[PDB]
Amino acid sequence: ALRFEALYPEGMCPGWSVVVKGKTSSNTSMFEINFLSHPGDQIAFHFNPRFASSRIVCNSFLANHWGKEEVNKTFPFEAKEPFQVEIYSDQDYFHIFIDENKILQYKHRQKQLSSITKLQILNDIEISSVEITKRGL
Amino acid sequence: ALRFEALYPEGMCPGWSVVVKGKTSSNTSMFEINFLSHPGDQIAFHFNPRFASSRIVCNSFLANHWGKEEVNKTFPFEAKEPFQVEIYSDQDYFHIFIDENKILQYKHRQKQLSSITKLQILNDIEISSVEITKRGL
Ligand SMILES: OC[C@H]1O[C@@H](O[C@H]2[C@H](O)[C@@H](O)[C@@H](O)O[C@@H]2CO)[C@H](O)[C@@H](O)[C@H]1O
Ligand SMILES: OC[C@H]1O[C@@H](O[C@H]2[C@H](O)[C@@H](O)[C@@H](O)O[C@@H]2CO)[C@H](O)[C@@H](O)[C@H]1O
């Protein structure tokens, strides 16, 4: 289920931050934050905290396939507890921060950064805030 | 031209703030921030700073017609200068703040507040940030 979507047709990458605040309803499910590229609504970056297994899975869905999963070692979320996730893009990576700690970097696979125009947030997250802000390099 | 859109299907009214930061490119045009209700994509609240005439026009587009315009006395924008617009909804009004000053209140005409799920920002605004945050009553 779609919880939030945003569209910025001029392109929200690189040099933008997305800050999502909220909490899960359960410890048995998952949510995702996806950055989509146009045309095709391909998934440039999929950030998928899975609470049942306590793993963050990151990947891309390009040319109709999921690529190699990048799975984080730590799981710095607690179910039903408020969190802040920030995703900041530079020319080389998405940088992920949770509760103001840097957690992981994900190297761009979709190199056409300016075609990333859409953000989708799905599944088990009760959102309290979404901020989309142009930062600079 | 669409500059930004957001969708929050559970309803982003009442008790939410939208904070838009940016600046115009010209002093000859206009921009708008629209709150849309579902179904129908009706315009519950249209906030339309018109720089050519230095007037903020507010209205609603319901049942296929614009209603009575509510035109503000002051015009606290300057073309090409960064501004912050906050729109906060309670049970009775949209409250508009520009650069942290309260400017106007617009009484709800679309009373089905929970059906307001979409935000659109159009025309002459170069956006630097959009924040959508659940505040409370
Ligand atoms: O790689 C991200 C996608 O994973 C898909 O699930 C994988 C799963 O992680 C893996 O362990 C294996 O079982 O194959 C599954 C199917 O590709 C998700 O279904 C998808 O939503 C993404 O999260
Ligand atoms: O009321 C908001 C809409 O106004 C429309 O323009 C009006 C205009 O403000 C008024 O002075 C008169 O000329 O009738 C026009 C047409 O209804 C805009 O076209 C529309 O976009 C809204 O801003």
Domain boundaries of chain B, sorted by first residue: 1-137
> Which of B18, B28, B131 minimizes the C-alpha distance to B80?
B28
> Which of A4, A44, A43, A42 minimizes the C-alpha distance to A21?
A4
Structure-token pair, residue B29: 């045009």
**Residues A83/A97, Cβ–Cβ less than 8 Å:** no
Phi-psi region of A131 (alpha: psi -120 to 50; beta: other; left: phi over 0): beta
Class of domain B1-137: mainly beta
Q: How far is A73 from chain B (nearest CA, A)?
A: 31
- Residues paired with residue B49 on neighbouring β-strands, in sequence order: B56
CB atoms within 10 A of CB A137: 7
Rounded Cα distance, B6 and A120, in Å: 10
Q: Helices marked H in A42-115 — which ranges?
A: none
**Residues B107/B92, Cβ–Cβ less than 8 Å:** yes
The CB of A48 under 6 Å from ligand 1? The reply is: yes
Chain B residues with CB inside 8 Å of A6's CB? 4-7, 130
Distances (CA, A) of B132 to A6, A14, B19, B88, B135: 11, 21, 7, 10, 10
Centroid of ligand 1 to alpha carbon of A110 (angstroms): 19
Distances (CA, A) of B77 to A32, B26, B69, B131: 38, 12, 19, 20
Centroid of ligand 2 to alpha carbon of B51 (angstroms): 14
> Which of A96, A95, A83, A91 minimizes the C-alpha distance to A136?
A91
Measured between CB atoms, does B6 come within 8 Å of chain A? yes
> Which of A136, A118, A122 minimizes the C-alpha distance to A12?
A118
The experimental resolution of this structure, in angstroms, equals: 1.1
CA angle A125, A128, A134 (to 5 degrees): 105
Q: Helices marked H in chain B — which ranges?
A: none
Q: Do A8 and B127 touch (CB under 8 A)?
A: yes
**Residues A75/A83, Cβ–Cβ less than 8 Å:** no
The set of residues, in sequence order, having a beta carbon less than 8 Å from that of A66 and lying 6+ positions away, is A59, A60
> Which of B31, B59, B57 minimizes the C-alpha distance to B45?
B59
User: Among all chains, which residue has been given the structure tokens 């409370």?
Assistant: B136
